[PDB]
Design an enzyme around this catalytic site. Structure first.
Site, PDB file in Angstrom:
ATOM      1  N   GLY A 163       0.803  -1.215   0.000  1.00  0.00           N
ATOM      2  CA  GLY A 163       0.000   0.000   0.000  1.00  0.00           C
ATOM      3  C   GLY A 163       0.837   1.266   0.000  1.00  0.00           C
ATOM      4  O   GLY A 163       0.279   2.368  -0.017  1.00  0.00           O
ATOM      5  N   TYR A 170      -3.077  14.734   3.666  1.00  0.00           N
ATOM      6  CA  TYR A 170      -2.830  15.277   4.991  1.00  0.00           C
ATOM      7  C   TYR A 170      -3.493  16.643   5.063  1.00  0.00           C
ATOM      8  O   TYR A 170      -3.270  17.485   4.183  1.00  0.00           O
ATOM      9  CB  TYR A 170      -1.312  15.439   5.231  1.00  0.00           C
ATOM     10  CG  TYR A 170      -0.593  14.113   5.152  1.00  0.00           C
ATOM     11  CD1 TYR A 170      -0.266  13.574   3.918  1.00  0.00           C
ATOM     12  CD2 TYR A 170      -0.390  13.338   6.294  1.00  0.00           C
ATOM     13  CE1 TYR A 170       0.216  12.283   3.803  1.00  0.00           C
ATOM     14  CE2 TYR A 170       0.124  12.051   6.204  1.00  0.00           C
ATOM     15  CZ  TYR A 170       0.432  11.523   4.949  1.00  0.00           C
ATOM     16  OH  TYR A 170       0.953  10.234   4.792  1.00  0.00           O
ATOM     17  N   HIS A 181      11.812  11.400  10.717  1.00  0.00           N
ATOM     18  CA  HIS A 181      11.653  10.045  10.208  1.00  0.00           C
ATOM     19  C   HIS A 181      12.325   9.940   8.823  1.00  0.00           C
ATOM     20  O   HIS A 181      12.580  10.957   8.177  1.00  0.00           O
ATOM     21  CB  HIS A 181      10.167   9.657  10.091  1.00  0.00           C
ATOM     22  CG  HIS A 181       9.402  10.425   9.037  1.00  0.00           C
ATOM     23  ND1 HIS A 181       8.962  11.726   9.224  1.00  0.00           N
ATOM     24  CD2 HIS A 181       8.952  10.051   7.805  1.00  0.00           C
ATOM     25  CE1 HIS A 181       8.296  12.124   8.144  1.00  0.00           C
ATOM     26  NE2 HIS A 181       8.314  11.145   7.245  1.00  0.00           N
ATOM     27  N   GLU A 183      11.395   7.423   5.290  1.00  0.00           N
ATOM     28  CA  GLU A 183      10.197   6.742   4.802  1.00  0.00           C
ATOM     29  C   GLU A 183      10.276   5.255   5.148  1.00  0.00           C
ATOM     30  O   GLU A 183      11.353   4.727   5.423  1.00  0.00           O
ATOM     31  CB  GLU A 183      10.051   6.961   3.292  1.00  0.00           C
ATOM     32  CG  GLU A 183       9.912   8.453   2.934  1.00  0.00           C
ATOM     33  CD  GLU A 183       8.780   9.143   3.703  1.00  0.00           C
ATOM     34  OE1 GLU A 183       7.618   8.717   3.565  1.00  0.00           O
ATOM     35  OE2 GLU A 183       9.055  10.026   4.522  1.00  0.00           O
ATOM     36  N   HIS A 269      13.683  13.729   7.715  1.00  0.00           N
ATOM     37  CA  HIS A 269      12.970  15.007   7.571  1.00  0.00           C
ATOM     38  C   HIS A 269      12.006  15.146   8.727  1.00  0.00           C
ATOM     39  O   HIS A 269      11.563  14.145   9.296  1.00  0.00           O
ATOM     40  CB  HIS A 269      12.235  15.184   6.214  1.00  0.00           C
ATOM     41  CG  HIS A 269      11.316  14.051   5.826  1.00  0.00           C
ATOM     42  ND1 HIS A 269      11.792  12.857   5.309  1.00  0.00           N
ATOM     43  CD2 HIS A 269       9.956  13.948   5.813  1.00  0.00           C
ATOM     44  CE1 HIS A 269      10.769  12.027   5.114  1.00  0.00           C
ATOM     45  NE2 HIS A 269       9.637  12.681   5.342  1.00  0.00           N
ATOM     46  N   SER A 281       0.534  12.862  -0.806  1.00  0.00           N
ATOM     47  CA  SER A 281       1.854  12.272  -0.991  1.00  0.00           C
ATOM     48  C   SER A 281       1.791  10.770  -1.180  1.00  0.00           C
ATOM     49  O   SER A 281       0.737  10.134  -0.995  1.00  0.00           O
ATOM     50  CB  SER A 281       2.800  12.605   0.151  1.00  0.00           C
ATOM     51  OG  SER A 281       2.348  11.971   1.312  1.00  0.00           O
TER      52      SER A 281
HETATM   53  C1  LIG Z   1       0.724  16.725  10.712  1.00  0.00           C
HETATM   54  C2  LIG Z   1       0.177  15.801   9.610  1.00  0.00           C
HETATM   55  C3  LIG Z   1       1.384  15.394   8.759  1.00  0.00           C
HETATM   56  C4  LIG Z   1       2.120  14.192   8.974  1.00  0.00           C
HETATM   57  C5  LIG Z   1       1.755  13.206  10.109  1.00  0.00           C
HETATM   58  N1  LIG Z   1       3.223  13.901   8.259  1.00  0.00           N
HETATM   59  C6  LIG Z   1       3.590  14.683   7.212  1.00  0.00           C
HETATM   60  C7  LIG Z   1       4.633  14.663   6.295  1.00  0.00           C
HETATM   61  C8  LIG Z   1       5.705  13.717   6.148  1.00  0.00           C
HETATM   62  N2  LIG Z   1       6.591  13.011   5.994  1.00  0.00           N
HETATM   63  C9  LIG Z   1       4.561  15.861   5.597  1.00  0.00           C
HETATM   64  C10 LIG Z   1       5.432  16.223   4.387  1.00  0.00           C
HETATM   65  N3  LIG Z   1       3.462  16.491   5.971  1.00  0.00           N
HETATM   66  N4  LIG Z   1       2.880  15.857   6.881  1.00  0.00           N
HETATM   67  C11 LIG Z   1       1.799  16.249   7.705  1.00  0.00           C
HETATM   68  O1  LIG Z   1       1.230  17.334   7.466  1.00  0.00           O
HETATM   69 FE   LIG Z   2       8.042  11.646   5.400  1.00  0.00          FE
END
Ligand SMILES: CCc1c(C)[nH]c2c(C#N)c(C)nn2c1=O
Ligand SMILES: [Fe+2]
Ligand SMILES: [Cl-]
Ligand SMILES: [Zn+2]
Length: 340
Positions: A163, A170, A181, A183, A269, A281
């Site tokens: 998946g 988001y 983190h 990926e 990142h 994403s």
């Molecule tokens: C707060 C919600 C949120 C999460 C949990 N993770 C991520 C990533 C990643 N990796 C990015 C780019 N934006 N983003 C978010 O807005």
């Molecule tokens: Fe990420």
């Protein structure tokens, strides 16, 4: 190639932009991947969606309230699940006095306010919502069908990719955070910010990733004891002040609406949302990723983390190494600096 390892920003003409896989090859040929992160600003005329109005009606099944604890640049966070709400309700919440972006002079000022206010009001976000909001028929840089080696292995070879190559949304508000983190399986990711306020990012060059791991293990020795890859829990915050103090190299950049960010294999990142926004994403891979996936250090903690078997990728794209690999003899350390 990019000896400074600084984050690069690319501005392709429509002709260069058209083919994602080819342009990504071009970015790496310039050393973009040394920074762990890159920005791509698409040509002005390109629009993945004509109108976002209908997205107000989209349901966010499980909004999350983000509870952050700690002090002075070192934090841990946990999630509380809230009741379902539409994007419209979520935007009105985001824009209320309790949750809205503070007044600020410039991004540097807003960043200071982020780190100063983390442990007051707990912000809410919606994450990992399945689906793409591109218009039908958009063929350039379509997050739902990038056609990378992930897709080849899935469609041709019938291998489950768990998946990770499907598109997720988001929905951010001010102060909602993505903790440090890389990926799953140390894949690439791509993030398009559809609309709304900016998203700020920090990134550590893949060649210095281990130094971030050693610093985190040192500050979070409890977490570290429980799981060798505890940063994959995405619960660990570390400020740029703390990074500067312990000399870990990093860079920062802000992504605005309409812009892509690419993260590269083993590029740590973290960042935060400026205000109400919506980003799409996915993860993806190229051949250069294969050696990262073979050595990615995985979470042992819980029963359900993403693990992709590397077998098919070594057999098909590294046939010269395949038997050496299966005999535990394919030993190397990655050169993070060269294109593949
Ligand atoms: C707060 C919600 C949120 C999460 C949990 N993770 C991520 C990533 C990643 N990796 C990015 C780019 N934006 N983003 C978010 O807005
Ligand atoms: Fe990420
Ligand atoms: Cl604030
Ligand atoms: Zn774990």
């Amino acid at each position: 190639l990019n000896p400074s390892c600084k984050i690069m920003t690319f501005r392709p003409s429509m002709e260069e932009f058209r083919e994602f896989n080819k342009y990504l090859a071009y970015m790496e040929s310039k050393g973009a991947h040394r920074a762990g992160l890159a920005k791509v600003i698409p040509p002005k005329e390109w629009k993945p969606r004509q109108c976002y109005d209908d997205i107000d009606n989209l349901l966010i099944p499980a909004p999350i309230q983000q509870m952050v604890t700690g002090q002075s640049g070192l934090f841990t966070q946990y999630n509380i699940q809230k009741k379902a709400m539409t994007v419209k309700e979520f935007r009105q919440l985001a824009n209320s006095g309790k949750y809205c972006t503070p007044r600020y002079l410039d991004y540097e000022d807003l960043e200071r306010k982020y780190w100063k206010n983390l442990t007051f009001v707990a912000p809410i976000y919606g994450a990992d919502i399945n689906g793409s909001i591109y218009d039908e028929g958009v063929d350039e840089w379509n997050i739902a069908r990038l056609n990378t080696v992930l897709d080849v292995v899935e469609e041709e070879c019938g291998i489950s990719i768990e998946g990770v190559n499907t598109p997720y949304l988001y929905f951010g508000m001010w102060k909602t955070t993505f903790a440090w983190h890389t990926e799953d399986m140390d894949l690439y990711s791509i993030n398009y910010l559809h609309f709304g306020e900016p998203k700020s990012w920090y990134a550590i060059p893949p060649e210095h990733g281990k130094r971030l791991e050693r610093l985190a293990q040192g500050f979070f020795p409890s977490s570290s004891q429980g799981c060798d890859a505890f940063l994959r829990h995405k619960m660990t915050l570390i400020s740029p002040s703390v990074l500067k103090k312990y000399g870990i190299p990093f860079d920062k950049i802000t992504q605005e609406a309409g812009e892509f960010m690419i993260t590269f294999p083993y590029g740590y990142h973290a960042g935060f949302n400026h205000g109400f926004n919506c980003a799409e994403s996915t993860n993806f891979a190229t051949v250069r990723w294969i050696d990262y996936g073979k050595v990615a250090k995985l979470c042992t903690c819980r029963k359900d983390m993403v693990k992709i078997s590397m077998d098919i990728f070594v057999r098909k794209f590294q046939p010269d190494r395949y038997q050496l690999w299966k005999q535990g003899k394919d030993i190397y350390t990655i050169d993070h600096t060269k294109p593949t």
